[PDB]
Amino acid sequence: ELPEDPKWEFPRDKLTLGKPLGEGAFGQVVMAEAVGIDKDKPVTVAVKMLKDDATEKDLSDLVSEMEMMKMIGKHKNIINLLGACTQDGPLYVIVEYASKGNLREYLRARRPPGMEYSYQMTFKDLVSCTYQLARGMEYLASQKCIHRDLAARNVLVTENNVMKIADFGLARDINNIDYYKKTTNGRLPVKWMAPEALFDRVYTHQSDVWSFGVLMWEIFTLGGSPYPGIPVEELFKLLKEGHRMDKPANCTNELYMMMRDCWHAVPSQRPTFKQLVEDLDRILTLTT
Amino acid sequence: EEYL
Ligand SMILES: Nc1ncnc2c1ncn2[C@@H]1O[C@H](COP(=O)(O)OP(=O)(O)CP(=O)(O)O)[C@@H](O)[C@H]1O
Ligand SMILES: [Mg+2]
Ligand SMILES: [Mg+2]
């Protein structure tokens, strides 16, 4: 069924699945040991796969997700695709393992005493985190690809605290159109979506910048949930009216203005990822 | 809840 890809294929006999790292309504990620996955050392990794009762579309979706990763290329701030098992057996997408989990949980677990999300990140750490992710997106955008699902839950943290952009499930190649237009309705990450994406079904690098602004908000609120007490239909209304989230507590006006710039009503007026990287670099340098 |  699935067209083999020798250069990326990896022997199942050299892979030992382990404990689950994350589960979803359309997937499953587990830890594993890959023998010789390193071309220079014939290795703890993560393996993404389908649920036991997945459909044809769930398969096509994961395959498309893998393909996007193959095309994007390597970058320090993008989770590394190591290989895949696509022949005679379930589809396994092997990716670099991030020992500190996703950004959301990473931050929430590192909030100050008494600020627990339920029953420590310095200011500079927050800027650095943001800067690393901006670099990752600048790279992705330069490949003329859009992520479409930027959010703290989709950022992984390695043992060395390196930020890695992940989950390319909604990622699209816009090299030929410079803008992806979703022709139909579907379940999308609405609270991280730009107005033109939500209402016009138009996605661009600038709609990714809007999402980056929301991600920035999540970072500075240490894992806060976008639009506090605002339900589904309630959010759609507010955005139409011009609503924008308030400034996080531990945030300078400069960084908040950067967030607000990412949420400019006019897509072309939002900063480019290159501009964000330059400005963030400047802020870090002065903070250092 | 994140995807609607
Ligand atoms: N390489 C990796 N290393 C460590 N943890 C990982 C990981 N890849 C995924 N995870 C964990 O699993 C979670 C979900 O991963 P991913 O974002 O790939 O799934 P998903 O959202 O596609 C699932 P669904 O669509 O089924 O909801 C991450 O937020 C993280 O906690
Ligand atoms: Mg995800
Ligand atoms: Mg998914």
Rounded Cα distance, A139 and A144, in Å: 9
Q: Which residues contact A169 (CB under 8 A, 6 or more apart)?
A: A61, A65, A149
Residue A6 burial by Cβ neighbours in a 10 Å radius (0-12, 13-18, 19+): exposed
Q: Of chain B residues 1-4, which have a CB less than 8 A from chain A? A: 2-4
Known catalytic residue: A149?
yes
Rounded Cα distance, A205 and A141, in Å: 6
Q: Which residues contact A11 (CB under 8 A, 6 or more apart)?
A: A85
Write the residue with the smallest CA distance to atom 1 of ligand 1. A97
CB distance A33 to A47 below 8 Å:
no
Rounded Cα distance, B2 and A258, in Å: 24
DSSP B4: -
- The first and second tokens of residue A98, run together, are 């991030």
Catalytic pick among A53, A58, A125, A149: A149
CATH 3.30.200.20 domain range(s) in chain A: 1-97
Rounded Cα distance, B3 and A152, in Å: 14
- The first and second tokens of residue A56, run together, are 């044809």
CA A80, A180, A76: angle at the middle one, nearest 5? 20
CB distance A152 to A109 below 8 Å:
no
Q: Determine if residue A206 is left, alpha or beta; phi over 0 gives left, psi from -120 to 50 gives alpha, anything else beta.
A: alpha
CA A195, A215, A48: angle at the middle one, nearest 5? 105
User: Hey, which CATH number is domain A1-97, 3.90.1570.10, 3.40.50.720, 1.10.1200.30, 3.30.200.20?
Assistant: 3.30.200.20
Determine the residue type at A56.
E
Determine the residue type at A5.
D
Q: Which residues contact A21 (CB under 8 A, 6 or more apart)?
A: A29, A30, A31, A46, A101
Residues with CB under 6 A from ligand 1: A 21-22, 24-27, 29, 46, 48, 79, 95-98, 101-102, 153-154, 156, 166-167, 169
> Between the CA of residue A50 and those of A23, A55, A71, A125, what are the distances in Å?
10, 9, 21, 35
CATH 1.10.510.10 domain range(s) in chain A: 98-285
Distance (angstroms) between ligand 3 centre and the Cα of A59 equals 11
* Side-chain-side CA neighbours of residue A174 (13 Å): 24
Which backbone phi and psi does A90 adopt, to 5 degrees? -65, 150
- SS (HEC) of chain A: CCCCCCCCECCHHHEEEEEEEEECCCCEEEEEEECCCCCCCCCEEEEEECCCCCCHHHHHHHHHHHHHHHHHCCCCCECCEEEEECCCCCCEEEEECCCCCEHHHHHHCCCCCCCCCCCCCCHHHHHHHHHHHHHHHHHHHHCCEECCCCCHHHEEECCCCCEEECCCCCCEECCCCCCEECCCCCCCCHHHCCHHHHHHCEECHHHHHHHHHHHHHHHHCCCCCCCCCCCHHHHHHHHHHCCCCCCCCCCCHHHHHHHHHHCCCCHHHCCCHHHHHHHHHHHHHHHC
User: Is A48 in the B-facing interface, judged by CB distances under 8 Å?
Assistant: no
Write the residue with the smallest CA distance to atom 18 of ligand 1. A167
> Between the CA of residue A21 and those of A27, A99, A101, A234, A266, what are the distances in Å?
11, 10, 8, 33, 39
Q: Tell me the technique behind this structure.
A: X-ray
- The first and second tokens of residue A114, run together, are 């008494």
- The first and second tokens of residue A15, run together, are 């892979």
Q: Which residues contact A91 (CB under 8 A, 6 or more apart)?
A: A2, A49, A50, A59, A62, A63, A66, A84, A85
Rounded Cα distance, A104 and A123, in Å: 17
Which among A151, A153, A232 is the nearest to B4, CB-wise? A232
Q: Which residues contact A57 (CB under 8 A, 6 or more apart)?
A: none
Q: Which long-range contacts (CB under 8 A, 24 or more apart) does A9-14 make?
A: A9/A83, A9/A84, A9/A85, A9/A86, A9/A87, A10/A34, A10/A37, A10/A82, A10/A83, A10/A84, A10/A85, A10/A94, A11/A85, A12/A85, A12/A89, A12/A92
Give the residue carrying structure tokens 């892979």.
Answer: A15
Quick one: which of A161, A13, A186, A166 has its CA closest to A75?
A: A166
List of chain A residues whose C-beta atoms are within 8 Å of the C-beta of residue B2: 151, 153, 189, 191
> Between the CA of residue A133 and those of A75, A77, A165, A264, what are the distances in Å?
11, 6, 7, 20
Rounded Cα distance, A276 and A23, in Å: 33
User: Hey, which CATH number is domain A98-285, 1.10.510.10, 1.10.580.10, 3.30.70.2700, 3.40.50.300?
Assistant: 1.10.510.10
| Residue A110: count of CB within 10 angstroms of its CB | 12
- The first and second tokens of residue B2, run together, are 């994140």
Rounded Cα distance, A134 and A274, in Å: 8
Quick one: which of A70, A249, A269 has its CA closest to A171?
A: A70
- The first and second tokens of residue A276, run together, are 């964000």
Q: Resolution limit in angstroms?
A: 1.8
Distance (angstroms) between ligand 3 centre and the Cα of A279 equals 32
